[PDB]
C-alpha cells in the first residue's frame, strides 16, 4: 500500500532517496510541522518536501517531484550526474534543519542522523598527539578489497602510517612519523552508509564501477567499533533500505528496496511501480558479483519503534493540507 514516484527527468538516486527519507517517519512528522505558511513555493525546499511527502501519503496516483527539483535548483540535466547521493541528502536535510530551528522539532535532523567521531594523529617519536572530534551525518565505506561491511568498518578505523614523504607536521616538535586514525564515539539512530562503488582516475578522467561482491547483513553489530560501549543500548542496527544502481556508469537504473515497518516485509520501489519483493531480492541479490547496492540505511534496534512511529493523517497540519489542496484545485 505504498505509492511510487514519477520518473520525470533524470533524477538519478533522488527518487530512491526520497522514499528512504519519507519512510523515516520521525523525520516525516517533523517535516510536516515545519512553518512553511509564509514560504513562497518557488524557492522553498522545505515546503516542496512537505508536498512530496503529503502526496506519498494520500495519493493513489504516482507522485511528482518537478517542483522539488526546482526548489534546490538541480534543474540542469547533469546536476544529479555531477553530484552524489549523500550530497543530495545534505542539501535536503540542511534546509529542513534550518527550517525547524526555533520550533518544537528543532534538532530533529542532528538527533536522527548525526553521530560523534574522533580523529587522532599520534606522533610515534615524540609526545605529541591531536584528538580532533568531528560530527558526521553519513559514512562512506570502502568495498574494494573488502568482503563484507565488517571489513569496511575495520578498514575505516584502521590506523594509517604517516611515514616517508607524508609525515605529520607537529610544529614545535617538528616533522615526525605518526599514525592517523578514526574512532567512533556515537552512532546515530538512523545510520546512512554509502558504499564506494566507483573508483576514479585523475590521470585519464574515467570512472570505473566496482561490481565486486560486498556483503551487508540484515542485523549489524557495531558495538565493537565504538570507542566506549554502553550497556542497555548496544550498537545493534537493523537494515531498513537498500539503494541499488544497476547501470555500469553514472546514470542508469536506480532502485531502492525497503521494509518500511521494520517487520522484514520488503518491497521494491522502482519509480512508478512499487511491488512487494523477497528478502532474498533485497539483501543478497544486491551483494554484487549488474545490480548492486550503493547506499544502505540502518536503524538502531532501540529506536526502531520511535523512528518508525505510526503516522496518521491528523499529524499533518490542516493549514498545510489546505494549502496543498488549494494548489491541486487550481491546476
Amino acid at each position: 500500500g505504498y505509492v511510487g514516484l514519477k520518473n520525470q527527468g533524470a533524477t538519478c538516486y533522488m527518487n530512491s532517496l526520497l522514499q528512504t527519507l519519507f519512510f523515516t517517519n520521525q523525520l516525516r512528522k517533523a517535516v510536516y510541522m515545519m512553518p512553511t505558511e509564509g514560504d513562497d513555493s518557488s524557492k522553498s525546499v522545505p515546503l516542496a518536501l512537505q508536498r512530496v511527502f503529503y502526496e506519498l501519503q494520500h495519493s493513489d496516483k504516482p507522485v511528482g517531484t518537478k517542483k522539488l527539483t526546482k526548489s534546490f535548483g538541480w534543474e540542469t540535466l547533469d546536476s544529479f550526474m555531477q553530484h552524489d547521493v549523500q550530497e543530495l541528502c545534505r542539501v535536503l536535510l540542511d534546509n529542513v534543519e534550518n527550517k525547524m530551528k526555533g520550533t518544537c522539532v528543532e534538532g530533529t535532523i542532528p538527533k536522527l542522523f548525526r553521530g560523534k567521531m574522533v580523529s587522532y594523529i599520534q606522533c610515534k617519536e615524540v609526545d605529541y598527539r591531536s584528538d580532533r572530534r568531528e560530527d558526521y551525518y553519513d559514512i562512506q565505506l570502502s568495498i574494494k578489497g573488502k568482503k563484507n561491511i565488517f571489513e569496511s568498518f575495520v578498514d575505516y578505523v584502521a590506523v594509517e602510517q604517516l611515514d616517508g614523504d607524508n609525515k605529520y607536521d607537529a610544529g614545535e616538535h617538528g616533522l615526525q612519523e605518526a599514525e592517523k586514525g578514526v574512532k567512533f564515539l556515537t552512532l546515530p539512530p538512523v545510520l546512512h552508509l554509502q558504499l564506494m562503488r566507483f573508483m576514479y582516475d585523475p590521470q585519464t578522467d574515467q570512472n570505473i564501477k566496482i561490481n565486486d561482491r560486498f556483503e551487508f547483513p540484515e542485523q549489524l553489530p557495531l558495538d565493537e567499533f565504538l570507542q566506549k560501549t554502553d550497556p542497555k543500548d548496544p550498537a545493534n542496527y537493523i537494515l531498513h533500505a537498500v539503494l541499488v544502481h544497476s547501470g555500469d556508469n553514472h546514470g542508469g537504473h536506480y532502485v531502492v528496496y525497503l521494509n518500511p515497518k521494520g517487520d522484514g516485509k520488503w518491497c521494491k520501489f522502482d519509480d512508478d511501480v512499487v511491488s512487494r519483493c523477497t528478502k532474498e531480492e533485497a539483501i543478497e541479490h544486491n551483494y554484487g558479483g549488474c545490480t548492486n547496492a550503493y547506499m544502505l540505511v540502518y536503524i538502531r534496534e532501540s529506536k526502531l519503534s520511535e523512528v518508525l512511529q505510526a503516522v496518521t493523517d491528523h499529524d499533518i497540519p490542516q493549514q498545510l493540507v489546505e494549502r496543498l489542496q488549494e494548489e491541486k484545485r487550481i491546476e
Binding site: 555531477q82 552524489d84 574494494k144 562503488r197 570512472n207 550503493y294
Partner: peptide
Amino acid sequence: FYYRGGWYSVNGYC
C-alpha cells in the same frame, strides 16, 4: 573524494 590511496565516488562521478 579521496580515501587511503585513491579517489572514489558512490554513483560514479568526480
